[PDB]
Amino acid sequence: NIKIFSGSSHQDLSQKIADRLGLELGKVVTKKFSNQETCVTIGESVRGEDVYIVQSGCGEINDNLMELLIMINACKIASASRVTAVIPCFPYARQDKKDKSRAPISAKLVANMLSVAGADHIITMDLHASQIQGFFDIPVDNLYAEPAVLKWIRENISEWRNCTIVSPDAGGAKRVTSIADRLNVDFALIHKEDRMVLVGDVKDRVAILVDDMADTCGTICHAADKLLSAGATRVYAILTHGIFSGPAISRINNACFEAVVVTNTIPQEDKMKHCSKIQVIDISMILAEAIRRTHNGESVSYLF
Amino acid sequence: NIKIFSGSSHQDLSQKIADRLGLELGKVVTKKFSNQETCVTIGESVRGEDVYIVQSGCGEINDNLMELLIMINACKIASASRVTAVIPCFPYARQDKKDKSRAPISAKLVANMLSVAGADHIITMDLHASQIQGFFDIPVDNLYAEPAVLKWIRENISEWRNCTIVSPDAGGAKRVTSIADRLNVDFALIHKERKDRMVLVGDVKDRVAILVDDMADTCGTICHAADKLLSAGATRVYAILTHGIFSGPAISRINNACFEAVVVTNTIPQEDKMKHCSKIQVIDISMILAEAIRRTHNGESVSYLFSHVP
Amino acid sequence: NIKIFSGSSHQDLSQKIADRLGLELGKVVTKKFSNQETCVTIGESVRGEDVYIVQSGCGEINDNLMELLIMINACKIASASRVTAVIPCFPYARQDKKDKSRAPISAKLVANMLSVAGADHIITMDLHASQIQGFFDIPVDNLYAEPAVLKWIRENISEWRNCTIVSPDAGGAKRVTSIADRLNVDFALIHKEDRMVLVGDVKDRVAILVDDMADTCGTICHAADKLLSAGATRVYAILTHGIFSGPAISRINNACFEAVVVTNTIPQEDKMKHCSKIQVIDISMILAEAIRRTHNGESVSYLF
Amino acid sequence: NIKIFSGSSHQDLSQKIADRLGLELGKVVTKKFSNQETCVTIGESVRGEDVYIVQSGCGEINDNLMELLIMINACKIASASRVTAVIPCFPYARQDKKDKSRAPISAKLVANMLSVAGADHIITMDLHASQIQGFFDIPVDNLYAEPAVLKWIRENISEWRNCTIVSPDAGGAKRVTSIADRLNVDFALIHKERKDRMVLVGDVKDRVAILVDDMADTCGTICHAADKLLSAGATRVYAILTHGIFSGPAISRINNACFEAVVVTNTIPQEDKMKHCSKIQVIDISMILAEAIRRTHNGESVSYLFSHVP
Amino acid sequence: NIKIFSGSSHQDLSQKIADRLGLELGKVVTKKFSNQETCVTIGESVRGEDVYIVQSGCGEINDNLMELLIMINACKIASASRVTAVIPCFPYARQDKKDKSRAPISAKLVANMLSVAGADHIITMDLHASQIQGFFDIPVDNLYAEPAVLKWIRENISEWRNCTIVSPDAGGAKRVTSIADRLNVDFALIHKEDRMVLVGDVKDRVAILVDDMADTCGTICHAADKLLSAGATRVYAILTHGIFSGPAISRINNACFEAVVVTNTIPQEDKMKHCSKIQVIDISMILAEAIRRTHNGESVSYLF
Amino acid sequence: NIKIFSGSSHQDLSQKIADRLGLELGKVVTKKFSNQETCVTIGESVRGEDVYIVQSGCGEINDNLMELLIMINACKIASASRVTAVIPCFPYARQDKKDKSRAPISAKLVANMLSVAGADHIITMDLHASQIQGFFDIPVDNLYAEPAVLKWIRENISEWRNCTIVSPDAGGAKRVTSIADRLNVDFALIHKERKDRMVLVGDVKDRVAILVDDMADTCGTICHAADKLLSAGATRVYAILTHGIFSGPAISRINNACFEAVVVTNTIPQEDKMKHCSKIQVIDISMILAEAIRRTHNGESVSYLFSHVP
């Protein structure tokens, strides 16, 4: 009944999921033509099957998005009973408002695209905005790394009981204040005027920077600077989604980060070799369980 | 080509918007039936016209919403060329997300109902979350009162060069900072750690502190923020809200609270609330709205109003 | 699998339904904020469940309609298998045509609204117009009170065998002539020119006024007048939907109605205390059975 | 900007409507293939034009319907600015409800097919049920022949001040009463209690009786109503129908029936049926239709025609 | 669970299907009113049933199309679980492109119509164009007569091993070259300049004309001429869909066709009496099996 | 009213189309983020304008597609009166059918994505299958390079009166014949019977042979067709393609192949490929595209361009 398919060569996360469910990933022929067009074809009958497509990681987002849409379609016109897009890291999630410009609302495009391509359900993790669930008309199950982060903090930061959870920017206030609350410790916040202002006490205490995403690590590196200048004992950076493109990896080592935690919503094995302070939290049991429960009609809200 | 209609009988804002465009409100026979059903009937041809329906400030939100939808539907099947909803205060806006709960995204529902009833355009003001623009597939012009607020501050708060722009919650951070940076002043941020206390970040000592939020309902939060701000060395406290809801004990909570003044736009009618509250000052947003309609209809840039008070 | 939720505090009808099916109504937190906004949240997992929301009665129709739409939505994005709106009394059912004006077709609005909010199916009773079923694209099961009315007439009106079933207005012709037929007795009809014209024989015989709805009872009171003037022995008024707002209750006692039957599609317990000629027909076994059969794939057309 | 096209070759009404607007029918190459498939091909640019397709009275309803849809689809993908269907007689209208049965709502289906094929507007006449306007989400201008009927009565029936306007069924009650009240005359109502008799309510004694229905198909009902009316003391009987279908034995049933006259609009072509039937008189509804198109295109009030024969 | 309904009186094909599945065709009342309107009503409860409507054959295509749409609708608002339109011969399939004119794309109209009327799935045979599957958003299972044709050719044409599969027009190139390939024999092609040009060798060998459709048989008759002129030993004509309207039947006998094969996607029993060279291939086991497999969640792609 | 925007920075075709209409390309801030996400931001009001977005020839199809969609979406919510996609070469066109496989109809998907992102019109050139026009419900103007190709042949191939127009595959038959008939010359057709040989039908002996296909990607097919054609007595071989893709070893395969010349339109930028390939000649299709936009906007017949090179 249930059938798990993967996206790009990124096959690690989808393989870890298929394991926890006692399945083999479905057979698919997936490639690019010489002239850049994505070519996919399902290697088995999916008729009347509850079908999961776990988004791929070969960096190239437009390539990954299209191959996702093509698989979702492939499956829909081949009479799969239901198709869930499993997108730990929601593409274009940061382009969710105009922001006073004549810019597009790209997350609403992507959302539309996933739906018209035929997705019946979405399973994602830590949406850059909670209102992105409102971009769809189909059910979205938005998972949190929150508990997996807390566990780690407690289990890895000796002084956590008197640490400060700091946000990279002004928009992150809500996310850090919740983590500050569950732990019962101080929060603070940074804001690029440039010059970086910090509000809240971080003197003589551990300072964990929490952000949902890192991309160039420009803001997150600087943030760590400023946190030293304001006399934080040590500075950690916890990012649910670790994208680390461009100069990121070298900017990280170069910074004072005691460590930089990520989830494996994005493949990290390559960047680890080039960065020793990186550590991963496995999110495959969280996605596997959300798949098993989405299938069975059992609750998912627990995992939250 | 242009035609403006009001909802209900809270017609002040409607009529001011119409005055400023040189127009009379369109004729509407609108009443509530014995069983609470709303009735509407366009007292005039709207065939091939560019129609605007302005959302009423009566108070009863579900009544008010049904009426808006009904007039939209009324005009569409009457062959209006285009129907715009002018909803200065967006209903169910504070309901834009699931919040770890098994709860509706009421705003996306309302978004949806506005769409199917036949709206082509929306013109709203200071959406509780910008992301609500993504709840539609039609265009949305989301206006800001920021410019007006800045103008109000500059011209009424002597110390505005040395003040502190404050968020009464964690969600409102970008909004304050954005004003802070423009006036080239400091910002502070109040977080409440529920049961049942509030924590302040950012220096407010010996400064004037201005509470800025997008909307104030019962005013339980802001009153407690006026106290915490004073406790932390604030010379005095201002509260500026774009949407003046002031339901339940709000008016009481305000007359008691240590606010120097509470300012609100007229996105929701205040005239009555003022009579019981001498702290309340009112920014007139009909010049913003009218101009937005005027531009919408002509094909002129509305973006001009995002930073520049007409 | 099946789950019944209620609307407003009106909890009597939905409780009667849940009983006949051997269920407890689902847990929900339903209220109004100080500033009039409806706030609902489902108190249990509805994932993969056939979900019934029985419309509420706290008079205020826009309040009741919205809380209905919000529950239908709540349920849809929480991955309920199917959501049926159970609306004995269809809101705005009288606003189903323009009627030569620039008026809205409100029943088509509401219909659209129920569908976009996510209803998969509608179970209703005595639609003010049969063509309101054509306002949807989803299945509608429209139930009749017809048989429950006939039974009552026969069982309560000694002279029924030679009575006359009269209509309040010209539009009711079809509904009364069917009831006149099943019983094999005379029909007649009234029409406000005002002055009220009556066509058809009512001299020396019982005269039962049948209408689908009563609101102020202005037309129905007058109708009874005229029926006396034309020498009806006694005058009954049978209304499937008893709304009785405004002066209705006092207009009723004040009138010669031997009695005024209603169904309990609307709560009547409060108006009964203020009106002794009122009697109710319980429609909960009809709605309960339509729910059980809609669930099971068994026929509903019988109940008709 | 305006362009009018006809369906099939029943082009009288089409051509009269075009004459009255000062236009020639657009060029259409329309034929039926060997296997019964319909072909259409717009013999001219319609790019950015305000197109009207008038529904043909050929007779074969499914043929006729497909053709209408095809021309609509043909014009839409050809970038017509707007496509209006002018369907004087709405197909499958008598199929607007389920009627306690497991039957289709064919009218809502047709409604749906008209929509997806790309119609933006409908202009129809005397919908069997007004509620069919709720089968669309696009605008519908539903025209009445009432005004014309009133005008026909006044000027041809000497006793119209003392007559009785009759419904041949229970469904047609509002329609008669509405005419009754306007002419300030009495109304009667015939109900048939199937097997197999008819029952009359309302005095018709020593009065002229006018049967008014929206459409007459085989005329089995109306003929039996002419007899029952005469039986109940009617001086004489008129039958007025907005849609003259007259299929099967209708023409026979009519020449035999005790009608003084049978009147019908030309919403469906009668010229041929007339030759075999000298009782048939024909109200010309092309001035109504043309005016409705003319207003539609200009942005003028169509409602003017609901009570006032142009 | 499964329920098969038929279209017009054409009841042979649908009866053959219902047999192979061990079912009786569903009860339906289907007629035309005196004024040409199609009147249908389902004679049984279809609630929660997987419903198949096998398109009818009473020649009149607009009549057949509408009665199809009406049945699909009837079923949808009566709460059938799923409705599959079974359309061996897709109506208006030749009107699938503009072709440089301001002509409609009728196959896209019909496709839209089937979908809005409520079809969830389509089972068809030899679509005039494969891209007609792209006219829908619902699954389409397009079956081939290809294998049934090959079998017949091999089993009926002694010299087939050295025969030539010829196409009537230039557009048929793809269809004939595939049949030429599976058999490993020559193909050729004809094209009306009129004067008919033939490309490819047909001298001294059997020449089978393959087309998806025949209508007047004007092109197919002429084609056979030309094939004689170019010295084909014998000429067969294989048409998946045999419509044969107008002068066709007389044009066929009058031509040199050794024989003219068809499928029974259209009723042929009447034209056989008037044409002895006609032979039919039964496609009912192919449609019956596609129905049984579409129901069961078992593969259909095999049949291909 | 009219406004033209380019995608990416492959702005030659865009700029030529704009030059020919007397317009400057609209202002666009378009860049790729660090994580490969595309950004777009319309540097100017498009409110109530008739906008055209021209598809870029960068190369990376999924990048290019996302960008197009994004600009479409960007303009729609910015209240553009109408948004047209001008996609000289339609992405995923060769993916229009299932081909007996469990494969996507990528073209119908792309069709769908173009629709939901908010396109009102498409203007494309030589769709791989005409049937792709049926993947939309909006209008599509599908242009032909046939006229230009005919004009190129007539004026560069001396023997064009005696030549043979060839299809490199079975699918391309109608396309060649259509050119064959117009020039009143013969046609031939190459079929490949995969593993691994090609079979020719139609006399090419002692004639000039012109390979005509709609697109050429790696050129593996056409090179092998140049050889087979020469083998079968062709004086010499021309290859004409409307869409010059030339990826992978194409440029190599071409310099080696016995083509007298390879011709392509500039639907995809060739300037760079030319420098490495002296066989490549380039038909300029911006006069066709501009004219198509010019007509689209005015309401003039585009069909004029289907047979007549402006």
Author numbering:
A (entry chain A), C (entry chain A), E (entry chain A): 3 to 195, 203 to 313
B (entry chain B), D (entry chain B), F (entry chain B): 3 to 197, 203 to 317
Wording from the paper:
PRPP is formed from ATP and D-ribose-5-phosphate (R5P) by the phosphoribosyl pyrophosphate synthetases (PRSs). The human PRS family, which has 3 isoforms (hPRS1, hPRS2 and hPRS3), belongs to the class I PRSs that requires divalent metal ions such as Mg2+ as the activator, inorganic phosphate ion for activity, and ATP or dATP as the diphosphoryl donor. Due to the important role of PRPP in the nucleotide metabolic process, the stability of PRPP content is essential for cell physiology and is predominantly controlled by hPRS1, the ubiquitously expressed human PRPP synthetase. Mutations in hPRS1 affect vital cell functions and are related to many diseases and disorders.
We determined the crystal structures of the E43T, D65N, A87T, M115T and Q133P mutations at a resolution of 3.0 Å, 2.14 Å, 3.3 Å, 2.11 Å and 2.74 Å, respectively, with 2 molecules in each asymmetric unit. Overall, the structures of all the five structures are highly similar to that of the wild type PRS1 with RMSD listed in S2 Table. In the low resolution E43T structure, the Glu43 replaced by Thr43 might destroy the hydrogen bond interaction between Glu43 and Ser103, which might reduce the restraint of both the ATP binding motif β2–3 and the catalytic flexible loop. It is confirmed by the MD simulation. The E43T mutant affects both the ATP binding motif and the catalytic flexible loop and therefore displays as low activity.
